[PDB]
Design a protein around this ligand. Structure first.
Ligand code: JFS
Length: 435
């Protein structure tokens, strides 16, 4: 695998030991061959699990998820997918890694797709080697891969709302269930219904995942209600997955706004990862996978692949060359390489709107490309009436940094800034000039 110009897809089935068995063998070989190596973890939770798998090996943990004293002599770096792409975008030196290892390489967040684009382009140029570790590479059509123990697969109607009757199988279960929902708001309603029926429920989503995932270890629980973030190497001692088989799809309409379309079917890769949360213990056969819909290739025309192009157009590779998307996922977007390349000062603005602003990539791009500076929030208030953001069925209002109460009416509307109470709170703080 470690030979230059090679990209290896390590596609062992979920739970086959890619992270805890194969990765340390790769890292030992890389250190023997003096290969400057990066390991990319999808989440801080996975970064911390990797530290335990790699304990004893000289690895620099570029994450405060790991409390360690480095020797200063490590040639293997470990960081999150998003940290890698973030450092590439910023005026910070990123070494030209001889070996690029991406764990949970199916992750479809924009920064992960961009990282795979950059890495696969370096390999195609003859500059580097890469290993992409995932049971579900792009375009996989198999939702039911192999497992460590037999799984009971059942197609069944799954609730997406509070229910009073007709789903006794949900609550009659005496084990632990991981339940994949299409959104935070949908999970909130299911979680409230289970709580009212006497169940102990933990909710996971992107913003809460590091903090809340620890509860799955520290407290007894009956249900984990999760969004798709638990597709990225989240491990549970569970005996059942309930899978809506539904997700939200960010869609750019008419180049001018982002909507959260659906819910609609998950990809086969997502469904396989959701199912792959169970059947992991060869001593516990008959874990259950209950699934409530079919799969579809809903990654086609998904905003994340366009956002990945906006990130890659703004990463230096060599002169004016621009990294391509990883070939198997390159058709998911109709984009022109370089169309989103910003001049130096607009690029800095773009980066700060994502990093400090915490805005979605698409929205950061609209603001930066308009020649707006990071602290200029006038655009949060001067949009069309149809861009009015609602809070409890009334227009949302903030006090501007000038001390004026104004209706939130962004010039560019991206549904992800108000998809749940926490998102809208963060966007209100941004519009007010509070970060
Ligand atoms: O680019 C942002 C960012 C992310 C991670 C870190 N970081 C945390 N612990 C570290 C140890 C070694 C090198 C970098 C480290 C710094 C900066």
């Amino acid at each position: 695998m470690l030979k230059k110009k090679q990209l290896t897809v390590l596609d062992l089935h979920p739970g086959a030991g890619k992270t805890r068995r194969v990765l340390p063998e790769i890292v030992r070989e890389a250190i023997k061959k003096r290969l400057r190596t990066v390991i990319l973890a999808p989440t801080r939770v996975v970064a911390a699990e990797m530290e335990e798998a790699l304990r004893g090996l000289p690895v620099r943990y570029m994450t405060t998820a790991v409390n360690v004293t480095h020797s200063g002599t490590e040639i293997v770096d470990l960081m999150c997918h998003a940290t890698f792409t973030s450092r590439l975008l910023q005026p910070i030196r990123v070494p030209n890694y001889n070996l690029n290892i991406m764990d949970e390489a199916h992750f479809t967040d924009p920064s992960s797709i961009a990282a795979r684009g950059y890495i696969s382009t370096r390999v195609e140029m003859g500059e580097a080697a890469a290993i992409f570790m995932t049971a579900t590479p792009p375009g996989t059509r198999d939702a039911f891969p192999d497992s460590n123990s037999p799984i009971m697969d059942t197609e069944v109607e799954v609730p997406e709302r509070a229910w009073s009757s007709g789903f006794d199988w949900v609550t009659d279960h005496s084990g632990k269930t991981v339940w994949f929902v299409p959104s935070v708001r949908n999970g909130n309603e299911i979680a409230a219904c289970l709580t009212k029926a006497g169940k102990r429920v933990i909710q996971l989503s992107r913003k809460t995942f590091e903090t809340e995932f620890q509860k799955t270890k520290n407290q007894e629980w009956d249900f984990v209600i999760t969004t798709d973030i638990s597709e990225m190497g989240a491990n549970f001692k569970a005996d059942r997955v309930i899978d809506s088989r539904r997700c939200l799809k960010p869609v750019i309409l008419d180049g001018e706004r982002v909507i959260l379309a659906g819910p609609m079917p998950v990809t086969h890769a997502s469904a396989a990862q959701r199912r792959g949360r169970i059947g992991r213990n060869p001593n516990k056969p008959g874990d259950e996978y209950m699934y409530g819909g079919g799969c579809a290739e809903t990654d086609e025309g998904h905003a994340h692949w366009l956002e990945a192009r906006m990130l890659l157009d703004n990463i230096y590779l060599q002169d004016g060359l621009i990294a391509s998307l990883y070939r198997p996922e390159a058709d998911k977007v109709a984009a022109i390489e370089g169309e989103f390349k910003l001049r130096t000062e607009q690029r800095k603005t773009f980066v700060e709107l994502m990093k400090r602003g915490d805005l979605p990539v698409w929205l950061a791009y609209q603001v930066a490309s308009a020649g707006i500076t990071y602290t200029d929030r006038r655009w949060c208030f001067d949009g069309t009436t149809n861009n009015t953001i609602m809070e409890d069925s009334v227009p949302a209002e903030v006090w501007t940094k000038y001390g004026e109460k104004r209706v939130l009416k962004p010039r560019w509307m991206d549904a992800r800034v108000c998809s749940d109470h926490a998102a809208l709170k963060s966007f209100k703080e941004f519009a007010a000039g509070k970060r």
